[PDB]
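User: Please fill in residues for this 162-position structure.
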C-alpha cells in the first residue's frame, strides 16, 4: 500500500520460466549492502502452481556460498499481489511485465512499508535491456530508494552473480 502501480490483467502462467535479476533497489542501504544483505537475492525461476500460487527459486549468500532457496508466494484477491512469509516481507507486487522480456516487482512488509521495500528488474535473457531499466527507473522515481544496483552479463551468468 505504498507502491502506486500494479499490473492490470496479469496472467502468471505466462511469467513462468527462467529469469535474471538485472537490477535491484531498496529504500535502505543495509537491505542491499553486501552479498549477505537480507534482500540481496537472485531470482532463478518462477513456477506457478495449478492452484494459482507462485514458486520462486532464488539464490542468496547465507554463509560460505550461494544457497538456492525456495519461497512460496500465495495468491490473494488481487491477481498482482501475492503473500509470502519469508525474507522479512509479507507481499510481492508485480508492477509491469510483457512476459517475454522483463518483469518488474517489489517486495514489502505491510507493517514497515518504508523500511522493507525492495524492487527488481528481471529479464528473460542474460543481456542488458535498456528499455527495461528505463521502465524500472520510471517506476522507481516515486519511491524512496536509497541504493540501486545493476549487473553486467558476465555476472548474470554466475551463481549469486560472482
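Assistant: Residues filled in for all 162 positions:
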Amino acid at each position: 500500500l505504498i507502491v502506486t502501480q500494479t499490473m492490470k490483467g496479469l496472467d502468471i502462467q505466462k511469467v513462468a520460466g527462467t529469469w535474471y535479476s538485472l537490477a535491484m533497489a531498496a529504500s535502505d542501504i543495509s537491505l542491499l549492502d553486501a552479498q549477505s544483505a537480507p534482500l540481496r537475492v537472485y531470482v532463478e525461476e518462477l513456477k506457478p502452481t495449478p492452484e494459482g500460487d507462485l514458486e520462486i527459486l532464488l539464490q542468496k549468500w547465507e554463509n560460505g556460498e550461494c544457497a538456492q532457496k525456495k519461497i512460496i508466494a500465495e495468491k490473494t484477491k488481487i491477481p498482482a499481489v501475492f503473500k509470502i512469509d519469508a525474507l522479512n516481507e509479507n507481499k510481492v507486487l508485480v508492477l509491469d511485465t510483457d512476459y517475454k522480456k522483463y518483469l518488474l516487482f517489489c517486495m514489502e512488509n505491510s507493517a514497515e512499508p518504508e523500511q522493507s521495500l525492495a524492487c527488481q528488474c528481471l529479464v528473460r535473457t542474460p543481456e542488458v535491456d535498456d528499455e527495461a531499466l528505463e521502465k524500472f527507473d520510471k517506476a522507481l522515481k516515486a519511491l524512496p530508494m536509497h541504493i540501486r544496483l545493476s549487473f553486467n552479463p558476465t555476472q548474470l551468468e554466475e551463481q549469486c552473480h560472482i
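For context: DSSP finds three helices and ten strands in the chain.
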